[PDB]
Each structure stands twice: as structure tokens, then as C-alpha cells.
Design a protein around this ligand. Structure first.
Ligand SMILES: [Zn+2]
Length: 257
């Protein structure tokens, strides 16, 4: 019964998921004055030309756009990564107000939302095995600010009415995740965790420096989703973000000077 409410939110998760207080928890604050350029880093390779989206699902915590991950169709490689990481899904975290919603922060700044493109390391065969490994996942995180509309997000926005409540899904084929990227692939990276229970410390985070802009109308439609199931009292799906966790014995590295 974890969530983001009044009595089940992030500050409670440790009782069921003690790794919530672990050594490598996410998100974190990215201090641009202490992150250090790492010349050993390579450019990201984002290879999404062959992506096969399938479905969009309201899981009661966010919505996931799911992909066919049974072949190397949409992969992330390079950067800090060794090997090939396959896209399984993306989802967002967002606020009730434009001044909060992101999970990572940058010099303590909160963005309106954050996109997570989740990938798993093909050496482990499937997602469920990958999450048991320290290098099992690679999550590309992208900040959202409110300003101009993001045209490539609109197809997501316009299906949201069909998945208003927890447990609803809809077909979502032929969606191109390249339309969600900023111009630059400059990034910060560090080792961390899933940001929802079970909070497993299996993630290489790659957080892009350049945010994307979305419109106030686009974010307002996200805020019409519901945490609840159909036929239950309405609870708007807002503020589904975990706050920054202690960095502990980690360093954040930058791909750029
Ligand atoms: Zn996430």
C-alpha cells in the first residue's frame, strides 16, 4: 500500500522496503558545482529507430508506455555503459504545481516533471533478473519545464482520458520516443536505484542536462489522471515524485565541461 499520500508516502516506504535507507538511493540532488567532468565518458548512443511501442497502462502510481523488448529494437549504449540496454518502458513523475514534480533536482531546483526511459542490460536475459544486479538497468532521465508545447508528447496526452484510472490500459502502437528528447545529449551520471518500491539499487542513472518544454495544457492533462480505480473516490494523480535522497559515498560525473 505504498503511494504518495498523506500516510503512505516516501517517508514511510522504509518500513516495508528497508533499502529505502540504503547506500545508493535515488533520486539525488545534482550539485553542478561539485559534479566533475569525466573525460573517460562517451557520448550516449540512443538507438530508437526500430522501437515498437505496444500499450499504455495506468498502474496506480504513474502510467507506463510499454515497448517490445524481446529483440534489440530500441537500445541505449555508450556513455557510462558497458553492453546493450533495451528500452522496456517510459513513464513520468509530475507535480500539482509547476514549481515541483521532478525527482532529481539541479542545485536544489525542482522541475515541473521528469521523464524516465527505463532500459535493462541484455546480458541478464530479462527485466526481472536485471533488477537483481547492480548494473542491471540504465534509466535516461529528462527534466520537463512548462513553456512551449512538446509536439512529440501530444499523442501521449491525448490517450490519457482512456486510461484515467488505475488498471486501465490502451493500445499504444507506433509511438516514437525520439520525439521526447531535447537537442543535446549532455548528461550527468551516477549509480543509484529505482525511485519506487522495491527501490532496488540496480540503476546506472543518466540525467540529461537540457530540459524539454511542455505546455501548461499538456501538464494540466497529466494532472487529470487518477491514482484510484474506476468507481472509487477520485484522487488526482499528482505529486508522484520521491524527494532527493542522500548522496552518501557516490560521485556524480558530467559528460560535458
Ligand atoms: Zn520513474
Amino acid at each position: 500500500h505504498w503511494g504518495y499520500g498523506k500516510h503512505n508516502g516516501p517517508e514511510h516506504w522504509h518500513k516495508d522496503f528497508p533499502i529505502a535507507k540504503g547506500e545508493r538511493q535515488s533520486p539525488v540532488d545534482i550539485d553542478t558545482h561539485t559534479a566533475k567532468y569525466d573525460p573517460s565518458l562517451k557520448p550516449l548512443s540512443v538507438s530508437y529507430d526500430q522501437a515498437t511501442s505496444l500499450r499504455i497502462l495506468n498502474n496506480g502510481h504513474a502510467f507506463n508506455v510499454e515497448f517490445d523488448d524481446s529483440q534489440d529494437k530500441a537500445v541505449l549504449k555508450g556513455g557510462p555503459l558497458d553492453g546493450t540496454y533495451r528500452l522496456i518502458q517510459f513513464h513520468f513523475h509530475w507535480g500539482s504545481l509547476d514549481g515541483q514534480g521532478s525527482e532529481h533536482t539541479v542545485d536544489k531546483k525542482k522541475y515541473a516533471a521528469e521523464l524516465h526511459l527505463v532500459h535493462w542490460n541484455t546480458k541478464y536475459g530479462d527485466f526481472g533478473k536485471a533488477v537483481q544486479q547492480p548494473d542491471g538497468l540504465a534509466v535516461l532521465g529528462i527534466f520537463l519545464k512548462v513553456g512551449s508545447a512538446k509536439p512529440g508528447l501530444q499523442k501521449v496526452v491525448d490517450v490519457l482520458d482512456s486510461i484515467k484510472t488505475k488498471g486501465k490500459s490502451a493500445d499504444f502502437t507506433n509511438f516514437d520516443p525520439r520525439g521526447l528528447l531535447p537537442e543535446s545529449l549532455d548528461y550527468w551520471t551516477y549509480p543509484g536505484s529505482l525511485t519506487t518500491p522495491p527501490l532496488l539499487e540496480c540503476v546506472t542513472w543518466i540525467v540529461l542536462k537540457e530540459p524539454i518544454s511542455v505546455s501548461s495544457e499538456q501538464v494540466l492533462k497529466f494532472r487529470k489522471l487518477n491514482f484510484n480505480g474506476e468507481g472509487e473516490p477520485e484522487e488526482l494523480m499528482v505529486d508522484n515524485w520521491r524527494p532527493a535522497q542522500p548522496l552518501k559515498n557516490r560521485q556524480i560525473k558530467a559528460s560535458f565541461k
